[PDB]
Design a protein around this ligand. Structure first.
Ligand SMILES: N[C@@H](Cc1c[nH]c2ccccc12)C(=O)O
Ligand SMILES: [Cl-]
Ligand SMILES: [Cl-]
Ligand SMILES: [Cl-]
Ligand SMILES: [Cl-]
Ligand SMILES: [Mg+2]
Ligand SMILES: [Zn+2]
Lengths: 454, 189
């Protein structure tokens, strides 16, 4: 459109902690956002991204999206991702791809699970008890990129990168009162109530309604103090490559997600569904054995491939011709709490589509709903007491260049007016067993939950 | 040099089939079962026709049965899962409950190396998503069974005179072996 020129870049001083160091001073500002690769040794852990002070914001509650510019505020009932794509286009910033700068400004933030209700007709049984947007995205004409591969810190801006450097260096950090939990963790279900729901799900798998359902429970506690101090210590401990801290108008999202939803890099699509998890074991001899048990488990390989078939279909609707490939299956990825079974699907985005169109076609993830997707979601809404909200949605960016990357917000806390929420699920098949799957949820978030207990 | 018509019967993995056919270089037109009439097909002039899987019965599969009756002996037709059951029923076969529920289990099937199994490995590991089979005792004489489950359920049929063949399982699925070569047989026979 008007600006095809590449953004002005300024290299700052390399330090491994550059993102946490610069973001500390912004952590309290609504629309201040960090994507952090968790300092992980991982093939998909290279970049930390820092934004704040958006030129434009989008907030979706139910059927309304509010688009707020400097003074202008509009409300619309239109498809939220169509509204987002219109706002990106209207910014008139169109740079070429840069493999070193994957986000060159553009949209960044949260697509909550219940945004999916805008793309599929679903029942309204589950209770909506958290007021936080289904979509909370800022448009940024600058960013700070920390590249752990090249050991580079880049400050880019489409306006005045020099003023932004100064604006950033001028901000200073008065460490806020420390985070404490002011109650014990408490589930939204008894172990009895889990069972009643676990049995009801398997009853639905026998009818052959569906093949797989992710069933989740939610823990709540009261907290006081600064959520940013909590994040610093969780980020250290979780080494998760799709980690994020979002400061929203309504509260904070602390994502320690290890899962990538969809990457769109120079039109090359990649999704890495996690399906299959075994807990990590103390003895280093017995833990190397878990990695092989998990890789070689027929029940777990079957469940994963079901989800690969689902993701192949979601991506295949919109992918180019015969581009949908499955280059890698059942790689085991070790994380502090758990070993995960990860498969990767690749494809090509057609030049007629946008990453936003790809995201609409696939959202929310097959890995955290089930198969068929619509029936899995119908059941989840029927049996889970409360809506998932920010949990099992996606955090990510849509660059002005066309690129995108997103997470699944598993291992993700919502902190809102003194209440903190943490959810844990698990794929359920006819073959799987009640107590194993109940205990699987605990194994997934115990280190998170207990690290905050003091 | 011919377009393939894929009749969508609203399966969850319909685009997996479209993509497999696209990988093999096929020009595929995807139309849904209630979005097409037999007259419309005549004007699109397809070279081959595929009847996709689906959750419904052959009766509730829009024009699926209509297409088999009208195009049998004029164009090659492949049926997958529902399309296979519709194919059987159109010639007077019956559909029945399977032995057990087959929700994304894989299973080995033995075959005779005929039709879409020409050149393929024996046995073959394939995935079934659905829990209905063609009744063997009812199967019309015009069909040979091309493959069997471990349980002796029908996993494939081929018409003895015309180019029309059905498979009960999902070749488009990544859990299923030589899906590509299977559909390439149908495409280039
Ligand atoms: N790990 C990603 C960047 C990233 C970190 N956390 C994220 C959260 C959501 C999306 C992307 C990210 C990369 O190296 O490119
Ligand atoms: Cl899982
Ligand atoms: Cl192997
Ligand atoms: Cl491949
Ligand atoms: Cl989880
Ligand atoms: Mg599992
Ligand atoms: Zn089937």
């Amino acid at each position: 459109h008007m600006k095809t020129l590449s953004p002005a870049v300024i290299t700052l001083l390399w330090r491994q902690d550059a993102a946490e160091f610069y973001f500390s001073r912004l952590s309290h500002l609504p629309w201040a956002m960090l994507l952090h690769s968790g300092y992980a040794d991982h093939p998909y852990s290279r970049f930390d991204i820092v934004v704040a002070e958006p030129i434009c914001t989008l907030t979706t509650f139910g059927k309304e999206t509010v688009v707020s510019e400097s003074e202008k505020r509009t409300t619309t009932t239109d498809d939220p991702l169509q509204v987002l794509q219109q706002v990106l286009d209207r910014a008139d910033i169109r740079p070429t791809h840069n493999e070193d700068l994957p986000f060159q400004g553009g949209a960044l933030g949260l697509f909550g699970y219940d945004l999916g209700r805008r793309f599929e007709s679903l029942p309204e049984i589950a209770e909506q008890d958290i007021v936080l947007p289904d979509m909370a995205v800022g448009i940024y004409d600058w960013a700070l990129i920390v590249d752990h591969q090249r050991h580079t810190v880049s400050l880019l801006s489409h306006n005045d990168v020099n003023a932004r450097r100064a604006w950033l260096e001028s901000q200073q950090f008065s460490p806020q009162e420390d985070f404490t939990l002011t109650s014990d963790w408490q589930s939204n279900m008894t172990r009895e109530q889990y069972g009643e729901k676990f049995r009801q799900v398997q009853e639905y798998l026998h009818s052959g309604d569906c093949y797989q359902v992710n069933l989740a429970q939610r823990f709540h506690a009261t907290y006081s103090g600064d959520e940013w101090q909590a994040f610093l210590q969780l980020n250290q401990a979780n080494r998760a490559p799709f980690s994020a801290f979002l400061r929203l108008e309504q509260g904070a999202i602390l994502s320690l997600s290890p899962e990538r939803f969809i990457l769109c890099d120079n039109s090359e699509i990649q999704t890495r569904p996690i399906k299959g998890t075994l807990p990590r074991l103390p003895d280093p001899q017995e833990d190397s054995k878990q990695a092989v048990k998990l890789a070689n488990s027929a029940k777990d390989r079957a469940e994963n491939l079901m989800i690969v078939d689902l993701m192949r279909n979601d991506i295949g609707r919109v992918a180019v011709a015969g581009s949908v490939k499955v280059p890698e299956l059942f790689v085991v990825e070790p994380f502090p709490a758990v070993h995960h079974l990860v498969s990767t699907i690749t494809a090509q985005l057609p030049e007629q589509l946008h990453a936003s169109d790809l995201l609409r076609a696939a959202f929310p993830g097959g890995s955290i709903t089930g198969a068929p997707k619509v029936r899995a979601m119908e059941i989840i809404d029927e049996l889970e007491p409360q809506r998932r909200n920010a949990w099992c949605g996606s955090i990510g960016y849509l660059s002005f260049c066309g690129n995108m990357d997103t997470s699944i917000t598993i291992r993700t806390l919502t902190a809102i007016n003194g209440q903190i929420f943490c959810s844990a699920g698990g794929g359920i098949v006819a073959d799987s067993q009640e107590e194993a799957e109940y205990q699987e949820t605990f194994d997934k978030v115990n280190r998170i939950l207990k690290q905050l207990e003091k | 040099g011919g377009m393939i018509l894929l009749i969508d019967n609203y399966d969850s993995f319909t685009w997996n089939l479209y993509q497999y056919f696209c990988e093999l270089g096929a020009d595929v037109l995807v139309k849904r079962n209630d979005a097409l009439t037999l007259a419309d097909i005549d004007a699109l002039k397809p070279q081959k026709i595929v009847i996709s899987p689906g959750p419904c019965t052959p009766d509730e599969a829009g024009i699926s049965l209509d297409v088999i009756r009208h195009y049998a002996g004029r164009l090659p037709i492949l049926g997958v899962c529902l399309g296979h059951q519709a194919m059987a029923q159109a010639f007077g076969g019956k559909v029945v409950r399977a032995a057990k529920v087959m929700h994304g289990k894989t299973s080995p099937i033995t075959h005779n190396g005929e039709g879409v199994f020409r050149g393929l490995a024996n046995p073959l590991t394939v995935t079934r998503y659905h829990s209905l089979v063609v009744e063997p005792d009812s199967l019309p004489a015009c069909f040979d069974v091309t493959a069997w489950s471990e349980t002796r359920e029908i996993m494939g049929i081929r018409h003895r005179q015309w180019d029309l063949e059905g498979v009960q399982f999902h070749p488009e699925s990544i859990l299923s072996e030589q899906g590509h070569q299977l559909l390439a047989n149908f495409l280039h026979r």
